[PDB]
Structure 1
Amino acid sequence: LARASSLEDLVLKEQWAIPVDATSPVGDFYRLIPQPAFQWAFEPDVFQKQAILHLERHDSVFVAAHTSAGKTVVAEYAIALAQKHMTRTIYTSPIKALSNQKFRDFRNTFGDVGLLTGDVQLHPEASCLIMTTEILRSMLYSGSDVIRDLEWVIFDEVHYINDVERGVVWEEVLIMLPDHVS
């Protein structure tokens, strides 16, 4: 086109640690995230809402709360996202007896949850392996091909870094972790 061509073209023309506010930010938890990966029997509180809001974007939170039962909402929303994306997640606890009922509760709440300890080795093929940190430190030094599929590593009781004979394990782990693992 010659006259139509003109008649159409004339019409066409650093900080690295962000201290998120305790009480203020979240006003719209349901405007975005309308299809939550996990459904509770109650309402998530303010800090649990903020942690979930950052877990959606594949960030790396550092929750520091008082009671252990307020934190496990974050620790199982991360496992619901891991099961939604087909990836894998590692939950690591220091005490051998604490990581048994966690196995029971995570297997009762959803799907497949393997457990690895000094003697137990239930289902080393699931997507929610529960371990003691000395086993993750031992399979980070070799490859172990489980590290190829991780998304989240949920360090459970991170105030054991202060221990005198085991505080070096938490820092060998936090140093040797590759970059694609939140």
Structure 2
Amino acid sequence: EWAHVVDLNHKIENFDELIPNPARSWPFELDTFQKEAVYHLEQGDSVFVAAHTSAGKTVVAEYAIAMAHRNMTKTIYTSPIKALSNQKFRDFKETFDDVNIGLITGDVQINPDANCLIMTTEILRSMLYRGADLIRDVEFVIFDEV
């Protein structure tokens, strides 16, 4: 139940074998504190990103699926705006290498058997009251713009 303040002036520079499996590694270099976020993800504890947009906030979104896809859990990206849902869906199609993505609308869900669903906050709320399928399968839920 504790929330420690990370100073952001420390680093464990063993990223090749800190993640013991071949998870993901990019040609563009990530920031040091955001590698630490990834490290914290694999431990089991929760996370909270207080950053800025257009400055590599997708580092957490990248390892949200990449951890879950190997370890066999699921992930929900939850955005309040519908346009944003479409946008980040497109992004997920683009950056990742063969991942089962999904998006819920009023009419019907795009990609029924999706690994990574996307939905509105209202639609998210409509899992806990209704009794949905993907609150069993999901462990690390992403929350957009808090």
Identify the TM-score tier after normalising by the shorter chain: 0.7 to 0.9
- Kindly report the root-mean-square deviation, in angstroms, between the aligned alpha carbons of the 2 structures: 1.8
Aligned to 2:114: 126
Aligned to 2:46: 60
Q: Runs of 4 or more off by more than 6 Å in structure 1?
A: none
Distance in structure 2 (CA, Å) of the matches to 1:147 and 1:25: 34
Aligned to 1:112: 100
* Deviation readout 1:105-127 (Å, 9 max, x if unpaired): 21232321001133462013211
* Deviation readout 1:26-70 (Å, 9 max, x if unpaired): 333334224341222212211211100101112211011123441
| Larger Rg, first or second structure (1 or 2) | 1
Aligned to 1:38: 24
Size of the aligned set, in residue pairs, is 144
The residue type paired with residue 123 of structure 1 is N
Distance in structure 2 (CA, Å) of the matches to 1:121 and 1:91: 15
Please tell me whether the aligned partners of residues 11 and 32 of structure 2 are also in contact (alpha carbons under 8 angstroms).
no
Consecutive unaligned residues of structure 1, counting only runs of 5 or more, are 1-14, 159-182
- TM-score, scaled to structure 1: 0.72
- TM-score, scaled to structure 2: 0.88
Instruction: Say if 1:23 and 1:117 are closer, same or farther in 2 by CA, change over 3 A.
Output: farther
Consecutive unaligned residues of structure 2, counting only runs of 5 or more, are none
Distance in structure 1 (CA, Å) of the matches to 2:127 and 2:139: 16
The residue type paired with residue 38 of structure 2 is I
Determine which structure has the larger helix proportion and give its number: 1
2:35 corresponds, among 35, 49, 57, to 49
